[PDB]
């Protein structure tokens, strides 16, 4: 049917994706070497109503969708563990 339930549902799903990202970031506050995640949101297709040139077209939206989740590879703080086997990286690099 035609109803703004199918748009607000995508709105709810988008906010829930954001909340999932937030909860995942919060659960890993004590994990060593974790990069925080951010959700990028971008709206759905637009339906264009054909009119009988015009300064602006008549376009109705459809909703939003999560498309890109980015991990910020920034250098986190260093914590001191006297254990001699622990090492940390100053810059970009990954152990294999």
């Amino acid at each position: 049917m035609i109803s703004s339930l199918w748009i607000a549902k995508t709105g709810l799903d988008a906010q829930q994706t954001n909340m999932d990202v937030i909860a995942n970031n919060l659960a890993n506050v004590s994990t060593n070497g974790f990069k925080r995640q951010r959700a990028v949101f971008e709206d759905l297709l637009y339906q264009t109503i054909r009119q009988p040139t015009l300064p602006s077209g008549l376009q109705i939206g459809t909703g939003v969708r999560p498309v890109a989740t980015e991990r910020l590879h920034s250098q986190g703080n260093l914590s001191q563990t006297n254990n001699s086997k622990d090492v940390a990286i100053k810059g970009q690099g990954f152990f294999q």
């Binding site: 035609i2 339906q47 264009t48 459809t62 909703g63």
Partner: peptide, 19 residues
Amino acid sequence: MTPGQLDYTSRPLDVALQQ
């Protein structure tokens, strides 16, 4: 032939077309 409201189901095989 006016496209309907889209349903966001998290399935990669589901597709919605441009008008």
